[PDB]
């Protein structure tokens, strides 16, 4: 997990404004969630051939579809896998008002076929420490909500929850983590999309997009479900299902 | 339906700022949705003894609870009914990105016991016309998100979708309707709460709260699921279940 067969290329432009275009296939766990009509509404991350992790506030159902291996949503020519969802596992502690514990697991009806462009992100262990100031990466097609059709990426620093409260106040709970406010927007991340940090040669899922600045401000951080706080529930769910 | 045993009293203060406190029990279809720990996160409306209608973006589950007959959330002394949810019916056309078709039905495990303070709102027929400019009423505890613990009410005018787009642009879809921007906030409405209009002596559910001004501005209208566009699905669901 966490080692793309196609290595990402992150330049200085990933750190400013709205980030930069990714190298195609270099974020191979990145998936798109589409409704039964093909409309992209959320992102997510493959954690193995049978399971995708996303945000609970995406409200995914078994009539939605996981699309893996995508780079350009406007291209009907690249190789992609449209994967049916067998069952949706929303974290029972999710609260649609506070948006806390904002994580859902999707079990696929048939396994994805892993390849150079389709593979899994690593999950952290519950006790992993991703320190404030660590440079992490968010990817997605989130800018299409407001424009490029190709997968974007941005490098942005993790904040401590205390400093994040300076921006978002009492909205910030223990099961959240913030990143950004460093001169780059967080808006390229789709709802439910990944925030990954590279530790020991492997990209690890540290956050899941929950919400960001309503104006995509470069000085307001994004807010993410804190995966370390929720990975024990992820593993219990996989083991029971 | 739509005829409270305790008649509402709406004064001029319902039309300005943040509205006014309701007469206790005068909105008897108003329910509160609480999580399994008792935390209020959404509103909804009884449409008969076995069914509550709310917003799909509330993400209600069968471990949440419908609370009927409530006036003061801070009082443990008034008579209320905590009703378990047997099954949740989310409209399959709901889109968590556009928030269109934002309606969910909750089937209760055991019927509510209707009374002076607990009874049903009327549903419109699909062809009903609620004209722009009509004064309607939104009720709820929505101000507690930002403060009074008792049920509030505001009188505010329906907008045409064309004029609503002046405020919300391409966010406004055919299955939405807007109300407000008349000098009063829409923020007293909980997510999933009622927007009712009185036609022919009966209060009828015209809207379900979807979202409003992020600053509760008195010059920005609230956006509601348009019940006339969704009542056919409501009746199909009741008839099939």
Residue ranges of domains in chain A: 16-27+121-228, 28-120+229-239
Asked if A191 is an active-site residue, the reply is yes
Q: Are A43 and A30 in contact (CB under 8 A)?
A: yes
Q: How far is CA A54 from CA A20, A45, B63, in A?
A: 23, 7, 21
Q: A211: nearest CA in chain B?
A: B97
Domains B16-27+121-228 and B28-120+229-239 share a fold: yes
Q: How far apart are the first and last CA of chain B?
A: 21
Residues from chain A contacting residue B36 (CB–CB below 8 Å): 92
* Catalytically active residues of B, by annotation: 57, 102, 191
Q: Are B136 and B199 in contact (CB under 8 A)?
A: no
Pull the structure tokens for residue A106: 């999707």
- Residue A135 is classified by DSSP as E
Q: Are B100 and B68 in contact (CB under 8 A)?
A: no
- Beta-bridge mates of residue B135: B157
Residues from chain B contacting residue A191 (CB–CB below 8 Å): 96-97
Fold of B16-27+121-228: Thrombin, subunit H (2.40.10)
- Please calculate the CA angle A191-A193-A194 and round it to the nearest 5 degrees: 145
- Residue B213 is classified by DSSP as -
Concatenate the DSSP letters of all residues of A87-125 into one string. Answer: EEEE-TT-BTTTTBS--EEEEESS-----SS--PPBPPP
**Residues of chain B with a following break (C to N over 2.5 Å):** 146
Pull the structure tokens for residue B41: 């996160």
Nearest to A217 by CA among A190, A191, A189, A185: A185
Please enumerate in sequence order all residues whose Cβ is within 8 A of that of A2, keeping only pairs 6 or more positions apart, or say none: A120, A121, A122, A196, A198, A201, A202, A203, A204
SS3 category, B143 = helix
Q: Are B192 and B55 in contact (CB under 8 A)?
A: yes
CA gap B50, B107 in Å, rounded: 6
SS3 category, A227 = helix
Interface of B with A (CB under 8 A): 35-36, 39, 41-42, 56-61, 63, 90, 92, 94-98, 145, 191, 214
Q: How far is CA A28 from CA A35, A122, A216, in A?
A: 21, 12, 25
Please enumerate in sequence order all residues whose Cβ is within 8 A of that of A158, keeping only pairs 6 or more positions apart, or say none: A130, A131, A132, A133, A134, A136, A177, A178, A179, A197, A206
**Upper half-sphere CA count for residue B147 (Cβ side, 13 Å):** 11
For residue A213, the distance in angstroms to the closest alpha carbon of chain B comes to 12
Cα B63 → chain centroid: 21
- Beta-bridge mates of residue B104: B54, B90
CB contact under 8 A, B97 and A41: yes
> Nominal resolution in Å?
2.0
The CATH number corresponding to B28-120+229-239 among 2.40.10.10, 3.90.180.10, 1.20.120.530, 2.60.40.10 equals 2.40.10.10
- Please calculate the CA angle B84-B90-B93 and round it to the nearest 5 degrees: 175
How was this structure determined? It was done by X-ray
Q: Are B135 and B179 in contact (CB under 8 A)?
A: no
Catalytic residue among A102, A155, A190, A210: A102
């Amino acid at each position: 997990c966490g080692v793309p067969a196609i290595q990402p290329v992150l330049s200085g432009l990933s750190r400013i404004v709205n980030g930069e275009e990714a190298v195609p296939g270099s974020w191979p766990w990145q998936v798109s969630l589409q409704d039964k009509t093909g409309f992209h509404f959320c992102g997510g991350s493959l954690i193995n051939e049978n399971w995708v992790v996303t945000a609970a506030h995406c409200g995914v159902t078994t009539s939605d579809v996981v699309v893996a291996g995508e780079f350009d949503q406007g291209s009907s020519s690249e190789k992609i896998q449209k994967l049916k969802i067998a069952k949706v596992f929303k974290n029972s502690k999710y609260n649609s008002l506070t948006i806390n514990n904002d994580i859902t697991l999707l079990k696929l009806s048939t396994a994805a076929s892993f390849s150079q462009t389709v593979s899994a992100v690593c999950l952290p262990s519950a006790s992993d420490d991703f320190a404030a100031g660590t440079t992490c990466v968010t990817t997605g097609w989130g800018l299409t909500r407001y424009t490029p059709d190709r997968l974007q990426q941005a490098s942005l620093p993790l904040l401590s929850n205390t400093n994040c409260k300076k921006y978002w106040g009492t909205k910030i709970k223990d099961a959240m983590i913030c990143a950004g406010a460093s001169g780059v927007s967080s808006c390229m991340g789709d709802s439910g999309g990944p925030l990954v940090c590279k530790k020991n040669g492997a990209w690890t899922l540290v956050g899941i997009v929950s919400w960001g600045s309503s104006t995509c401000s470069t000085s307001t951080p994004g807010v993410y479900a804190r995966v370390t706080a929720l990975v024990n529930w992820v593993q219990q769910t996989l083991a029971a299902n």
